[PDB]
Amino acid sequence: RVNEEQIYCYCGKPGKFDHNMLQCCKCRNWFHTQCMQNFKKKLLRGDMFFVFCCTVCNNGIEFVRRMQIEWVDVLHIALYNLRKQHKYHHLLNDIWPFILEQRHQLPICEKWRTLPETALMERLKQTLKDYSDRFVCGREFKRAPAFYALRHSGPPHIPKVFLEPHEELSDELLEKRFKLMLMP
């Protein structure tokens, strides 16, 4: 009755989407990063912000590009990796440190990367408000609210990129068609 059908990589083994797996834009098949050619980077759980095209669809040349991600993406990644932390998460105590730890590693613009901490705090506070649909705000008794959590169980929202088989794989096309930003 309830057997979950697991998708498979071309290697023949199953896998998890939010755990080192990417989907080809052209063929729409899923691949283990290891089962890819020269992809060897540890990936935070939920972080799939890449544009991938396999060797089959791209004339034998594997195509990977890292996306440029916004603060909401960083926050969703933060809350997704933490929570899987025995209800909510204090902004200053649990969310703030983690982003600071990973700021260097995250695919964001230099402005975001080198942004002052006070200006960063207010920017993060507002982002969580603008994205109230994804983030619940929690308040302690007789305390200003400092607690946040994902309103639902899901991983970071990531825009789907599906190309026609005959289309060029230019960064120009990806930005014109899908409104994406790519990390240089």
Ligand SMILES: [Zn+2]
């Ligand atoms: Zn493919």
Ligand SMILES: [Zn+2]
């Ligand atoms: Zn595989």
